[PDB]
Amino acid sequence: MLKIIIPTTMLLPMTWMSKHNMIWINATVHSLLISLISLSLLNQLGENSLNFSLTFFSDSLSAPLLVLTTWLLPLMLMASQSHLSKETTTRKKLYITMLILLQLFLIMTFTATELILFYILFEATLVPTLIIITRWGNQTERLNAGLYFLFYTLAGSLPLLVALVYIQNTTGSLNFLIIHYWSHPLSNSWSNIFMWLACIMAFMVKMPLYGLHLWLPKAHVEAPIAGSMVLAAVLLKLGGYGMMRITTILNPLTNYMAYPFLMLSMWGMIMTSSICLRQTDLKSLIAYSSVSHMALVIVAIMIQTPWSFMGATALMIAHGLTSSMLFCLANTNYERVHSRTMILARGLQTLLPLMATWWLVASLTNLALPPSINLIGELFIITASFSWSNITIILMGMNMMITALYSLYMLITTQRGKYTHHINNIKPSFTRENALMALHILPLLLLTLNPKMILGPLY
Amino acid sequence: TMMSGRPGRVPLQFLPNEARSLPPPKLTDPRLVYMGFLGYCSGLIDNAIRRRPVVSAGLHRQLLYVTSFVFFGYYLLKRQDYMYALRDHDMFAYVKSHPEDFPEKDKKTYGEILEEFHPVR
Amino acid sequence: MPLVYMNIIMAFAIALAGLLMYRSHLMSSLLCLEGMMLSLFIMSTLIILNTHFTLANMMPIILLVFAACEAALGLSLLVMVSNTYGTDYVQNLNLLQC
Amino acid sequence: NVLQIVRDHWVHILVPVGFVFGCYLDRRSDEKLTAFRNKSLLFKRELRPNEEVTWK
Amino acid sequence: SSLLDLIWLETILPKTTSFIQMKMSIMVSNQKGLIKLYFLSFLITIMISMTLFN
Amino acid sequence: PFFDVQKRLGLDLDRWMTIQSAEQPHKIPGRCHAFEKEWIECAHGIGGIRAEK
Amino acid sequence: MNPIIYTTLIMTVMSGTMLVMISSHWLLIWIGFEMNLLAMIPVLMKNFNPRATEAATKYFLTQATASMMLMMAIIINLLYSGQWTITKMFNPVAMTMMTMALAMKLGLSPFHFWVPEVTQGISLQAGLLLLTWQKLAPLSVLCQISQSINPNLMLTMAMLSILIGGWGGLNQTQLRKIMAYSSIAHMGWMTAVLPYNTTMTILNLLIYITMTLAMFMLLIHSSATTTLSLSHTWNKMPVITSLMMVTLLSMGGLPPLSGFMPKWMIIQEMTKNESIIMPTLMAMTALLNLYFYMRLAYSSSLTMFPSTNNMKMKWQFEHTKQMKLLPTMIVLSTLVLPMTPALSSLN
Amino acid sequence: PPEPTIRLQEDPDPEDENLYEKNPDSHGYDKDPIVDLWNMRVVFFFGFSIVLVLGSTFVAYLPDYRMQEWARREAERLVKYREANGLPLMESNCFDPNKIQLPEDED
Amino acid sequence: WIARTFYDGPEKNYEKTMAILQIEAEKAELRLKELEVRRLMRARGDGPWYQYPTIDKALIDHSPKTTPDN
Amino acid sequence: AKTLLHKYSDIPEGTECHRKAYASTSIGGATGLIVSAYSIALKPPASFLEGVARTGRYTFTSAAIGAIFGLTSCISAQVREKPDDPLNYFIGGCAGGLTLGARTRSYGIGAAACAYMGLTAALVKMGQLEGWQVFAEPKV
Ligand SMILES: CCCCCCCCCCCCCCCCCC(=O)OC[C@H](COP(=O)([O-])OCC(O)COP(=O)([O-])OC[C@@H](COC(=O)CCCCCCCCCCCCCCCCC)OC(=O)CCCCCCCCCCCCCCCCC)OC(=O)CCCCCCCCCCCCCCCCC
């Protein structure tokens, strides 16, 4: 596993010893090279795992997440190259340092043989994101957004540390392999109920679960483009990965414990999809769509069936890619208009046809058009929920219809109609933005050819 | 645990004579390398605070910081290893001397253990 | 533990309570502190003499010397405060607040 | 021109050096987990005439 | 959008927490700096420890 | 915390004044010398918990 | 004052602390406390002004009352057992009196009222000394008699100190009062593990001392005592502000910083003793300390506050005196989490 | 009220700069044409040519460590054996009941 | 070619996992035993740990004390 | 001290409603008296009479809270015929919370009181049932 970790660490001295005008090129090239190295991890076995050492292992649940994390950094650098043009060299190097540190923390988090190491890195990811949000943010609400993002996560995750140390004191180990092999049932007790809650709430708050999702719109709207990309693509999947890893010790308590969260997610997907219909901000709409998708992923994880797990993994990967692309498109519009309002810039297909094509493809992928992996995960989770109960189909269908509705609403409002007359500073789209969209979209359509790579360990 | 009152312990010895029976930490120990990294970071921060070229202001000063950190870290690692060795030694001695408190559990096979099965539906 | 020790402990408690009241006049605070040390001297001397522990006949002298040095320090501080404000009133020491 | 482009292009070698060092460290850490080499009940095998270890 | 998300969900956890913590901070930090009250509280506290913990 | 400098150097800075049965001037005995001597000899080398029990 | 006199007074303070730490006779411990108190007052009153005099007299009153209570506890212990050695206390009443005296010396709640005002009155160097060195002797005495403490009272005052520090730090704009409330909260964290493990107490003491030294030395370097004065530091020395922000994040217990070590280890040790509720409440309350640390970081480094014209002269000058070990303290308070198992050295 | 109505000495908000005006064929990477062009070239090459193609081909030709055709052959041989010998394909019990020691109820 | 130049056989990972599992199980059992030993030592006080000091008996004076009855 | 705790706890949960109410009233009165003592020490409002009025108000409020909590919880336990159930403590605890809201005469504090006192009472009952320790002894 160190063959990935060490180059990521060496990215820092390379960045800090680079020329004043060669930081972006070197960072992008070496990040792309690191990503190529990460591709080797995908080869996975039907047996236990890829146990490299006592500290790190790899699995077909961790491998796609690691590949996505390594692939995201060059895209974030490409997106950040634009708005940081008038920045001093030291501060640009600091921004790149923050991105590299976040990648390193995520990479070490996804392998994490031992649960306290997982918690330590899962919390270490909180600092670079906070600095990025509250330092390189445009508006004055970035401070409040960062406070919300920090305190929701910490309030959720502080009981998890107590639960983990108690579990290690009782069982004797927190290594995931021993935990899996020596698992024992949980008796229906008040202490066990509260232990279940302490183990579950930390990952629930970062999904975000409906009713605990308030931090996400603030953090996503106030963050710079790279921060929004990473938050929507990788940081949301940490909760799902943690739940998938930790639900092994929560049985058979999960059968009845899951109901409050299942009801919340099933109604909250409808609520957030309906919220998306009446939104005046692109970023807020994309954030609420992310909330709906992650609520459906929560339902999948709570059902706890093989089809549920495969669908949840596929949907996590697909949502990460799609949300990153949508945020990038919104940022391209914003850097021209400086408004971040849907109704201001209209009829952009006439002025920017290729960017309109990118918008259409991104909206179709968010709409879960077959045979995209978005629909693969959606359909697997829907089938698993139907097997759980035949009445879920109503809510799932309502969510699908509303999702298509607001996706095409967002496409039509910005791309179709008549152009705004008084806006005359809409320059042709640069090659950088087009390449960013292409590198977002092509991996999705290549992955739909090999869906087994993102279906997780239960394939 | 509390080993302050442990018998035959000298009041201000950093490393007792019985600690010399343990293998010393290697010079390429990862913890020693981390201590050297800490010293290098201290040197860089010292350069930055004094408003000097951070990478190449004082090579002798950075070398001194790294060497001091490595030296103290080596001795600290020796003491830590000795303390953990004492803990394990006392644990094993107490288990040996109190057989009634640590009985041998009668080994049992899964084919003859009845565990409740909870279906996932 | 007979009644004389109880009376001396009661005297110590009364002096401590009087110190903790602060009607006014920091000089009264110093007086309460000195009453406390006097009670300590008396009760420790009684304990030491009753048990014929010869070597602690030193300790009351040491206690008296140290407490009188502390008394001198407190008197100097009170004099400085009075020279600052013109009086030793407790309520004049309100510049620093929680 | 050599000895001049090196002063500006020396940085490029660092990420690659890190990769080979990480591979070496992975193999070195692998070397410490050989307690069951050719001792698993599934892959218990008799050595070849010119074989010392089943895997490295 | 409004009634639940922007109002009541905001009222439940974050606004309530902020209000309670600010009120407690105001109560704790609003001390005039008079040693009269401080040592009166110390006397009250000392008495409680003697009679409630033994 | 406690740094046993006296035991390390054998200085005896304040141990002479700790107990009644420790070398009083002119061999003047304490009122409860025998009882404290017996209690100390009982509890020597045993540890606080066992000495108390 | 004269540098010779200042050096002699500092040595007398340190020698009183060492006399407390190395003696085995209760009278010698009391003498060490008296010597430390006697030599501490001129250090606090070094820069003569009414505020320093008021702080010094408040500190003298509090410490004299605590010393009188400690002497009374010693005398009661001697009465109920002819023993002078610092060991098991031998008496329930004596133990209660001694615990309150040591809490008053340390500033634990409800005896916390003097710390913020004394810290505000004195300068930054006297504040550094008072908040770092003046905790060693009472904590060592508490450690020596940890088997005698009633867990209920110790845990009650520890939780009270944590709550009081968290709530009182939210309301402050002065940096010295913020540091005082932080010290109160950290003391409350330290004393909540004495009934279970003194090694955790010493580890927390070392980590907090390093962090507090780093913070006070940074505040002395950029001579600011208010939030707005510190908000001008970015326009001259931004590196100091960035280091201060990292140190503030460390002081809030955010992993993977050094400040996460003590809380983590204390929670783990307390959970080993079947205690669950108190660590949860303690972490929830430390969230408040983290909040006001974040507010300070926002005002200091993460945003740029307006400046004044006269900073252009300050741009032309460099600090005449450089404080040694500032770099070492920052690194030790920031990047020592991977070296956690070194605590077995009985630090 | 002789106040200047100015709160402070502040720079005016700068106007956004067009990359195309000073340099057509700007590629949107950098204001310096040479660094811009080389950034475009390295991004396009190392992404599309290297990763998106070679890594995709590598993933396509990954060897079967998940052991799918192995399972196919095992199932084929087992079904051949069982159909021929009259065994009824798959068995309901995963483990032979002879080796499980159930606990006698005696209720 | 890919399996030859980039990857290894299944037995390598199999036996590495066996070794890792053995190490982790030994560590867990040691942790349980260490907690139990700590509890027993603190409860009884007969172990090398939790030894709290008592008065040294070498401090006692054994001489005639001007009084026959000590 | 712990005498009030013993007098309250010795009564069975489902019997002697009046005894439980009286014990709860005594505990509430003691808590209110302590809070009043702290308030008087830290803040002398204007005079002796206004201070004793403040003390009486605080003590009566706390005693009423305790009495209502105890009475409601005991009646719920008796009527529902399911003792050792945290729901009874929830109901009684925020009956006390609603009485606090009525005494202070504002609806918001009443609702917040029902939430945060019913949950607290249910937690205390759960801890009694499962044996949770707030002040744990040093086991190891
Ligand atoms: C996970 C563990 C692994 C990674 C560890 C992470 C940490 C590593 C480093 C730790 C600290 C040591 C170095 C820091 C010294 C500070 C000096 C500095 O600021 O940089 C300036 C300096 C360049 O500037 P300059 O031209 O010299 O003069 C400019 C003045 O210095 C001043 O210029 P100015 O005043 O005009 O500019 C003002 C600017 C300047 O202010 C600063 O930049 C202050 C520096 C940040 C504070 C450091 C805190 C201490 C360490 C905390 C680390 C936290 C990690 C935990 C994760 C959470 C992340 C927060 O401040 C601002 O702009 C205000 C806004 C601040 C933005 C938000 C603040 C976030 C700070 C958090 C940073 C945390 C990561 C630090 C990474 C390294 C950064 C240099 O940077 C360097 O060149 C030194 C960097 C390291 C040198 C590496 C060379 C070795 C490579 C060759 C051998 C190959 C090795 C492999 C061997 C095998 C190969 C064959």
Ligand SMILES: CCCCCCCCCCCCCCCCC[C@@H](O)O[C@H](CO[C@H](O)CCCCCCCCCCCCCCC)COP(=O)(O)OCC[N+](C)(C)C
């Ligand atoms: C705010 C936005 C969303 C945030 C996230 C919300 C999710 C958290 C909700 C927690 C899930 C449920 C908690 C406990 C479920 C256990 C089932 C139990 O509640 O039902 C009955 C329990 O009966 C009563 O409910 C007793 C509890 C009454 C007190 C609880 C307070 C009720 C409302 C509190 C909600 C506050 C949530 C937010 C807190 C800030 C069953 O009766 P019984 O057979 O006897 O008990 C079985 C359990 N045993 C076996 C261990 C004994």
Ligand SMILES: CCCCCCCCCCCCCCCCC[C@@H](O)O[C@H](CO[C@H](O)CCCCCCCCCCCCCCC)COP(=O)(O)OCC[N+](C)(C)C
């Ligand atoms: C912030 C991290 C801590 C930094 C600490 C300051 C670093 C500079 C200090 C330089 C070395 C000081 C050691 C003194 C030399 C000899 C010490 C020896 O004589 O004393 C021994 C004592 O040794 C010291 O305690 C060991 C100090 C080592 C401190 C390192 C531990 C830090 C925790 C892990 C964080 C990693 C930090 C690594 C980078 C510095 C014997 O003690 P003993 O008379 O029998 O009983 C008293 C102690 N009791 C009561 C608790 C039992």
Ligand SMILES: CCCCCCCCCCCCCCCCC[C@@H](O)O[C@H](CO[C@H](O)CCCCCCCCCCCCCCC)COP(=O)(O)OCC[N+](C)(C)C
């Ligand atoms: C633009 C106008 C048209 C021009 C183009 C015309 C030509 C049309 C062709 C385009 C699509 C038509 C469909 C034809 C499909 C044939 C190829 C297919 O068969 O190969 C697939 C193979 O594709 C790959 O498996 C999937 C691509 C790999 C995706 C990884 C993404 C690359 C990394 C980038 C970063 C990752 C980001 C996301 C994180 C997870 C499936 O093969 P498979 O049946 O199975 O077995 C392979 C052969 N075996 C048996 C020897 C093993």
Ligand SMILES: CCCCCCCCCCCCCCCCC[C@@H](O)O[C@H](CO[C@H](O)CCCCCCCCCCCCCCC)COP(=O)(O)OCC[N+](C)(C)C
């Ligand atoms: C016709 C061909 C069709 C298929 C094409 C396949 C192309 C594959 C390219 C993608 C490779 C993926 C990267 C794999 C890296 C991980 C594997 C790594 O561990 O292998 C190491 C070797 O790594 C490779 O050297 C990495 C190659 C990276 C470069 C790929 C080529 C393109 C690089 C372009 C760089 C820029 C060129 C300059 C342009 C200006 C050695 O491993 P080792 O621990 O021993 O393994 C033990 C098992 N043994 C015994 C069999 C060895």
Ligand SMILES: CCCCCCCC/C=C\CCCCCCCC(=O)O[C@H](COC(=O)CCCCCCC/C=C/CCCCCCCC)COP(=O)(O)OCCN
């Ligand atoms: C977004 C904010 C969400 C914040 C998190 C909300 C849920 C928090 C989880 C509950 C807190 C405590 C976690 C328990 C730690 C695990 C330890 C454990 O499970 O052991 C239990 C310990 O169980 C407890 O002690 C729990 C006591 C609860 C006290 C703290 C209350 C905090 C708030 C509780 C109500 C809210 C919980 C759900 C919140 C919903 C979301 C807001 C048994 O202890 P023993 O005594 O050793 O064994 C019994 C046999 N002798």
